[PDB]
Design a protein around this ligand. Sequence first.
Ligand SMILES: [Zn+2]
Lengths: 52, 58, 154, 84, 50, 62
Amino acid sequence: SEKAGHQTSAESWGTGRAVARIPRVGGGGTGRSGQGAFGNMCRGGRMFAPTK
Amino acid sequence: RRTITAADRRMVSGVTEKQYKKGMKKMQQLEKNAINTQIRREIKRVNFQTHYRDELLQ
Amino acid sequence: ARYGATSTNPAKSASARGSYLRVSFKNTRETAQAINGWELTKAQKYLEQVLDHQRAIPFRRFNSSIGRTAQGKEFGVTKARWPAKSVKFVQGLLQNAAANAEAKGLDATKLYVSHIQVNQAPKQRRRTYRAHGRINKYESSPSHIELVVTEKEE
Amino acid sequence: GKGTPSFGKRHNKSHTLCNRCGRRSFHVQKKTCSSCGYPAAKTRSYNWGAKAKRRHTTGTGRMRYLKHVSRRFKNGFQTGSASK
Amino acid sequence: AAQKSFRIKQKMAKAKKQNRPLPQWIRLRTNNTIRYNAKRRNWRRTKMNI
Amino acid sequence: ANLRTQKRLAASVVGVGKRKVWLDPNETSEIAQANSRNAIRKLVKNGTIVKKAVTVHSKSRT
RNA sequence: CUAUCUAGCGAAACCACAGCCAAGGGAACGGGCUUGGCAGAAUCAGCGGGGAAAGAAGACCCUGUUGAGCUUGACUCUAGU
RNA sequence: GUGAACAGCCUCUAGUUGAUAGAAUAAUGUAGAUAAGGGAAGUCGGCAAAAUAGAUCCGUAACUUCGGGAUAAGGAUUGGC
RNA sequence: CGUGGAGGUCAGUGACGAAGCCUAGACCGUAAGGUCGGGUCGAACGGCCUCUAGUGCAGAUCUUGGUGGUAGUAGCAAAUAUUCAAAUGAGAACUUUGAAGACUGAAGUGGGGAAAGGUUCCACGUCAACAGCAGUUGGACGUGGGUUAGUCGAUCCUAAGA
RNA sequence: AUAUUGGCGAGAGACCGAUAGCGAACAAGUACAGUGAUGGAAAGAUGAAAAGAACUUUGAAAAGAGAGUGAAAAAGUACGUGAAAUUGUUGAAAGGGAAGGGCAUUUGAUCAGACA
Ligand SMILES: [Zn+2]
């Protein structure tokens, strides 16, 4: 799916905080808040060169 | 002047007293395992304050 | 009911297994290791004196920063304690193994303990609320206990 | 303080329950639901809220009448009596 | 509250009749994936937003 | 056994506060059947329950 | 009242491996290398030299043919009048 | 009730006796105090603490926008019957 | 050399036990890796000629999950304060009753209320979990009961406004 | 004649096979957070059949030990197989402020082959 992985609004937190610069979900109430995304490395992320 | 009770009403529909005790134990236990899990899976990415001020420049 | 490495026979031996108990592993392992190799009649007397504050328990491995005391001298160590919950939860297994033995037909005057191992159980978990609006785990360290007793031969 | 004290004076709502979507979005002071403008005839739907065009779209619910239209078309909107 | 509407009392009635456990005659059904009530709620943990 | 409700009801009946209701300690098996407010009326006249005295606040020195 | 000892309960920061020193050379100030001095289980309460301790992809400086707030007679434009 | 007083303290009606405890009394701490003679020599600096304190009577300067300054300063007094 | 899949092939292996996993047991290969025995375990999987790819990890302040040393350590020290006997119970420093000692000291630790919460109110049963100790107790768990208005309020009026 | 990631019904795939594939294989746009717009999960497998452990005994009880079912409790609802970190007991070995490793060999353990 061309929208795979990008069904998410996520932006990096940045420096200062001691996590990576990966994009990270924002919110609360669950365990997804803080998880990485928009990446090939991240669980619930896309893949590298999604097969067209 | 009473015939029925909640336990009597549940008598016809399967469960008895001993079986209610037995089922309630395991039900509470499997409700508790989920709390153990959710605590584990939140404890990391709950302490990430969004705009913590870090009161020290000097 | 699979057990640890038993270096004995199943015919003249009876066993016990207390599972998912809410006592501390670090203070139960020492309680078991302090009686491994003993006779029941001279271990149940000792676990009863511990509660009355005589004949403390030696802590050999999980012994960091605890205080010293004189009731360790009979074991050579100088660090000991009286854990009155692990004591109770071991004494409520010695009795059951002795009952199992009495129903198996083994004379309870020469019974000794051959195998006793404490294990690490699933943690039952909570939260404690720290400073600056954050969270950290405040959880338990349960323990399985597993015991075997048998009668001395040549 | 602006934090833990200022979260103490939060006791008067700026939202309440809408009659068209039943969730807490109806702004009392201006009388509009933020998810489907209730005075307005249209429903608030935007093509950038794609994940909001699935929580409130056709098929989310019951389809009391629309579940039967395909069943009626295959037969030709026939009326009257069944058969012998 | 003490002086309230009717809609709120109605929602509270629903949320009171929903605050029971799973009945045990369910678990004996032949293919039952439902071991407990997951949408359980009480007034300490989760405040319902009405 | 447990008598918090009985102590509540006795004070509410007699009018005085919870701290001026004296229950006889020797009659727990009798008091604990008082799950109502009419039996408390029976017990206060039987003497199993007592309205204690107003603590003194003398005014002679003043 | 704590600290300290005990019954119960029971985290966190941090962590390449871990932890005795002098001099030498070396990324020009070593916990490890080299040459020497030495070195005997397990440890408790304090301590605040040290671990270029922890905090945070330097908040001064410089570069980037990266930006923003602002000013003006910089360039090019503009609602209004 | 004391007192000028809904101050501070004690008490009646009413309510509570909940905050994890036990033993011992080491340093270093937090909080609260005292101090011989000297009295800011300490220190950037009287930072901190200390003294005065209420009420009555007497007596109250320079200056002043003539209204104030002013509780100025500086003295004695206070109980019981 | 190896991995997931595909076309051919060994009329391949296999419930008389395939794959996977453990194996300071053995063999081959310089090595990538391959083969065998043993134990476990329970249903599919290999070798050769070829095709194809989402194809091989020690790191990325990598992502998700899980577990450690630190550690039975720091610590559970504000709000004056608790004690005795009995009953219950398996078990009582913490429940109940009684006797004492104290405090909030009427701008209260009282009685009632507006918002807000939503049945926490009350009874009975009960302790696997929460009450950062325990617990027979509980706003906890399980099952039930409970809110009566011609006069109290909304309803009605209008204000700044919409 | 052309277009068609929507809807309804059909058929296939050199596709993914539960950290993958739609976010979601399951009571998922559910639980939950946020005033709100919005954000947004985790979680599949006992076995052929429940035959889900009658009965005795210890314990106050949970549960334990025998028993029994089952082809197997080394399948007991925390249930396919059940790896590693980490961890307990037993066994073996060593150990003066490091441990680990390379070459060579003694001592011990284990393997080897009949060359019958
Ligand atoms: Zn709406």
